[PDB]
Design a protein around this ligand. Sequence first.
Ligand SMILES: Cc1cc2nc3c(=O)[nH]c(=O)nc-3n(C[C@H](O)[C@H](O)[C@H](O)COP(=O)(O)O)c2cc1C
Ligand SMILES: Cc1cc2nc3c(=O)[nH]c(=O)nc-3n(C[C@H](O)[C@H](O)[C@H](O)COP(=O)(O)O)c2cc1C
Ligand SMILES: O=Cc1ccc(O)cc1
Ligand SMILES: O=Cc1ccc(O)cc1
Lengths: 399, 399
Amino acid sequence: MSYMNFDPKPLGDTNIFKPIKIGNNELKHRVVMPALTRMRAIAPGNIPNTEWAEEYYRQRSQYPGTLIITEGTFPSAQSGGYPNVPGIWSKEQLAEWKKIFNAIHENKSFVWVQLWVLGRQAWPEVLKKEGLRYDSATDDLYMGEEEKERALKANNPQHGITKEEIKQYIKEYVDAAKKAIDAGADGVQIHSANGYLLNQFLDPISNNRTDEYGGSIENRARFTLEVVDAVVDAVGAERTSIRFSPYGTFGTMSGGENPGIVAQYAYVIGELEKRARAGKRLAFIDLVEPRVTDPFLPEFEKWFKEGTNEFIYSIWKGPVLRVGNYALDPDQATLDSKKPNTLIGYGRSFIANPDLVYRLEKGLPLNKYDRNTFYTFTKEGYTDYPSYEESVAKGYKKE
Amino acid sequence: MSYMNFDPKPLGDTNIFKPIKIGNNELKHRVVMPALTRMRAIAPGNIPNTEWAEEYYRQRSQYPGTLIITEGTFPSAQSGGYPNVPGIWSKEQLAEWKKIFNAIHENKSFVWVQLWVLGRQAWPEVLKKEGLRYDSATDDLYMGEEEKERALKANNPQHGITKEEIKQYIKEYVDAAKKAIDAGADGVQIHSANGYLLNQFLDPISNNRTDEYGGSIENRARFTLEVVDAVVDAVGAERTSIRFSPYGTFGTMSGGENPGIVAQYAYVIGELEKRARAGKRLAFIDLVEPRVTDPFLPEFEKWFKEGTNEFIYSIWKGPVLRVGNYALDPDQATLDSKKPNTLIGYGRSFIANPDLVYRLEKGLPLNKYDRNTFYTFTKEGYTDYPSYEESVAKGYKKE
Ligand SMILES: Cc1cc2nc3c(=O)[nH]c(=O)nc-3n(C[C@H](O)[C@H](O)[C@H](O)COP(=O)(O)O)c2cc1C
Ligand SMILES: Cc1cc2nc3c(=O)[nH]c(=O)nc-3n(C[C@H](O)[C@H](O)[C@H](O)COP(=O)(O)O)c2cc1C
Ligand SMILES: O=Cc1ccc(O)cc1
Ligand SMILES: O=Cc1ccc(O)cc1
């Protein structure tokens, strides 16, 4: 129960507090809550939590005109494998989502459902129980020895998905997207980052396929672009977005130590820009910064300093969300925000600060997060972080 | 006979005046003379015109420790097609180049031969007269209708070179490189920019081949990388460099309006870094700035402001030469030179100022260039531009 140890600076006079249109939505400011997995969903139906989640999103959407991106949400059972993450395919899931979306909308804020497909990050023993596959780009590229052992113990070995299985995932992204928007979501974000399934195709470290979905930049990007084009066909580009982590190592991805990694992302993003010029553009592209190559490590650890995301601005001409260690670095937030149509995301600091937008605007101290309750099935560390005024009444101080 | 109309600033205390090792050469400063076609060579035989050219290069190398890159120089007759541009394949050419290199070395300066292969930019009647092909990546993608008629009038229609003929060009780059080094050059620069033959393979606008030399990023880069690897094998990576122009439109190239551009160069530059890390690092990569999309246009005209070359610094960890409209913008030169191992090239202003280095160091007025004599077969506008003291004696004033 203390404040992050830094000197806060007000952002209210920077471009962070300038309004911007993102697809259909008229944002009042550029402080975004990125996708944050919390593990409060109810098992066995992957149901958004009925007692606690509406309050959690209600709190963090309190500042009018905020973009909220939901926790990663599975578009089908085969996409999942964590029981306490929500899904968005079933009627009982959708019923609960609608209440969440309503709370955010009642705040005059916006909600975007992140569509998350795990691939090899999934727990294969959990999948096995449900008669589901342990999927990736290849049979044989395990993300590590422990994961390989877990898969073999479960008798659910890693499976390089087929072209038909690829089409099936495509159908499930589309299905979940239509369902999300029908239930009242403003848009959906395709998760193509952090070493999950689409990223597993993007990165040569995890994809040495010799069909059309591996062996070249264009082929590695194919699955991701089919997903984008199918979701766009179904709900429109204005209601679609995507997330990449060019410099990420989490999930046993390449990161910037492979000098060919920038070209991969330059290509896929250039393809999205091509599509934008030909018609309606994707609402935004979300990039994880090299500031955070692995979100399990504390701020400023494994900050890749030898490469940046600046290349995007020479390719994509629409809004760009940037996320990674900004809470502690208002100076860098302010600098990045001077670039055209740039939104700044705050992850761990939004977990800890329900009224983050206001604190950022006024340069107030930020609550420190409690890592212990990032992923516990608890109200504690979810909806009981105080507002600023409450932190002062409790005598909070720098850790 | 006037100065450029701008406010000069001294650069002597910036990074531009710090020494740096480039290949085998200890540069005293980072002001570079890039390649500049002047068309003073003797026809027939493409013979360097030592009677005029020795003095031109002596003048511009006067400041000890300067890197000079020659005018584009043909590595073989079939590479050519401009009768007053020099070659470096023949005994009689080499005998003249030896004298020019000597003069530069007497100044304790350095000289790098730009190896220039024209492809479709060539004049097809001039090649036809010599019994030579008019070459490109394809038989049918002409740089324009004027140029197409010209080729058909000369019964030398464009020709997409075959793998055998590509191998022949590679052989010629190797041959001309060994020859150039043997005559005393410090290095060679492979010209892969400004809409010439290699750039014609890199850009989809001039290359819709469906063999291994086009149809993808890796394919389109293949000829350029083969040239690099051959030359490096023949003369060493420390005597090898390359030039690109990602944002160039000169030569009917795509430039930045094609959003796939950046990926193409990130891919080629990442491949060059992979080579470096395996122990064969090119001496430097030379990039034309988006500041000058077409060097036939006045400074500040057709400045592509929607894209930058900053992506290089996330990929290549070797020296970078950057060129384009720097004379008139010492603030931008200074800023760009703060990036690691960055050299600043000056083209039109080096044409006009024999003692440009000194004038940059001290913040002195610069002579204005006269385009009229860029390509005339004369000493006027070549060797008669005045030193600073001489311009003061003649009462020069701003344009
Ligand atoms: C507890 C936790 C859960 C996260 N869950 C998600 C997720 O569901 N989807 C996703 O794309 N990124 C997720 N991330 C990554 C964040 O959105 C973000 O990119 C990262 O935490 C760096 O930003 P920050 O330094 O502001 O926290 C998560 C990070 C943490 C710490
Ligand atoms: C008259 C003239 C001749 C040129 N010749 C060459 C050449 O042989 N090779 C080359 O790579 N670029 C050539 N360039 C391009 C220059 O090297 C340079 O990229 C361009 O002029 C922009 O830099 P600047 O604004 O300092 O002139 C030429 C430019 C001009 C104006
Ligand atoms: O649970 C942590 C987490 C991190 C990144 C993601 O993309 C998803 C989940
Ligand atoms: O003569 C102009 C010229 C421009 C760019 C080049 O690369 C070569 C020549």
